[PDB]
């Protein structure tokens, strides 16, 4: 599934991401745009046996287990293919584990380099919510 920005925003707000640890909703939609380009089936192989999965590109060495990455910690305690769903619940619940405090969105390199410091609210203005 490739989401539209408003539809992803509404689904993210329903799963408790609006102002989660002080982060406004637009941050989360801007991160998904630059990480997966809003695709739930997005995958990225890295220069190490890790692969990043789904809408928020969650890493197979640390957060989900794919049974293929050397060293899997699996801290979200989830199989990586569960994150490739058109429903984003699993992906949001793991993201909430990753963001333990008000500086946790630095876990996504694209958010830090491309969203942080810009008008991320522009991604949700005019969406019904």
């Amino acid at each position: 599934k490739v989401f539209g920005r408003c539809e992803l925003a509404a689904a993210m707000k329903r799963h408790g991401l609006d102002n989660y640890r002080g982060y406004s909703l637009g941050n989360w939609v801007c991160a998904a745009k630059f990480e997966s380009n809003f695709n739930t089936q997005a995958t990225n192989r890295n220069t190490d046996g890790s692969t990043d999965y789904g809408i928020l590109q969650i890493n197979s060495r640390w957060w989900c287990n794919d049974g293929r990455t050397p060293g899997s910690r699996n801290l979200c305690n989830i199989p990586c293919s569960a994150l490739l769903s058109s429903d984003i619940t699993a992906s949001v619940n793991c993201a909430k584990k990753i963001v333990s405090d008000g500086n946790g969105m630095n876990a996504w390199v694209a958010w830090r380099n491309r969203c942080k410091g810009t008008d991320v609210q522009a991604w949700i203005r005019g969406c019904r919510l």
């Epitope: 406004s24 830090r112 410091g117 008008d119 991320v120 609210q121």
Partner: antibody, heavy 116, light 107 residues
Framework: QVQLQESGPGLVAPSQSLSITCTVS????????VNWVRQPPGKGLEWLGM???????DYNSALKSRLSISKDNSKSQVFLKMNSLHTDDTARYYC??????????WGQGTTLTVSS | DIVLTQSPASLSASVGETVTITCRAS??????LAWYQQKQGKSPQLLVY???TLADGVPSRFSGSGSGTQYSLKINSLQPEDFGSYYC?????????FGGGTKLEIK
């Protein structure tokens, strides 16, 4: 330690253009916006404008034609330039860091009096 | 431009009273509203952002509420250091504007 400190001329005649500097420390200007706010003697706060981490600027509707904000990321400085000065521009001017739609750290302000 | 109407202009109160300050927006600001305290001769200090969230270090006797267009700051059992001015500010697109201010003074 996040610090913002304003420096300005103190007194100006209508024939001059105002330039005020905000020197920041403890954070990068690429990751945060800086807003400029003023407060006339014994009055409330007035928003003047801002410059985002990416360099885009947005201004108060009424004052946009007289204002210009810019920054030098390596010097860690933000500048407010104002021209066509009127005595109602007499105020304390403040720069404040914006972090995700709240102004969490504020400078002490500089007082400016506009003369004849 | 969305304008904010803040009231009252002044409140006289004793220590230990609860008081409420309101800001009404001329258009929906979608919860992007912040409150600041300004002590005599000091910089404004952030108290509350996104309508309800306390800034780090603000005591829990401050609470914010509101939705759409009317918003409130309530101060329960106010203390000697709470006297000063209070301002609301919205962050829905640009230009941003401030409420006119409320002076909280000793009774």
């Amino acid at each position: 330690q996040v610090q913002l400190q304003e420096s300005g001329p103190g007194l100006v005649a209508p024939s001059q253009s105002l330039s005020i500097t905000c020197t920041v420390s403890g954070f990068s200007l690429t990751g945060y916006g800086v807003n400029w706010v003023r407060q006339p003697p014994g009055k409330g706060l007035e928003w003047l404008g801002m410059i985002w981490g990416d360099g885009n600027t947005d201004y108060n509707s009424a004052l946009k034609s007289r204002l210009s904000i810019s920054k030098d990321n390596s010097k860690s400085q933000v500048f407010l330039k104002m021209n066509s000065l009127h005595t109602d521009d007499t105020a304390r001017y403040y720069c404040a860091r914006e972090r995700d739609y709240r102004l969490d750290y504020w400078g002490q302000g500089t007082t400016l009096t506009v003369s004849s | 431009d969305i304008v904010l109407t803040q009231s009252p202009a002044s409140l006289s109160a004793s220590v230990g009273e609860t008081v409420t300050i309101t800001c009404r927006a001329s258009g929906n600001i979608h919860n992007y509203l912040a409150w600041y305290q300004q002590k005599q001769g000091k910089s404004p200090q952030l108290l509350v952002y996104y309508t309800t969230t306390l800034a780090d270090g603000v005591p829990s006797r401050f609470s914010g509420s509101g939705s759409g267009t009317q918003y409130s700051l309530k101060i329960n059992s106010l203390q000697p250091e709470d006297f000063g001015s209070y301002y609301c500010q919205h962050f829905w697109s640009t230009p941003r504007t401030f409420g006119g201010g409320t002076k909280l003074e000793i009774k």
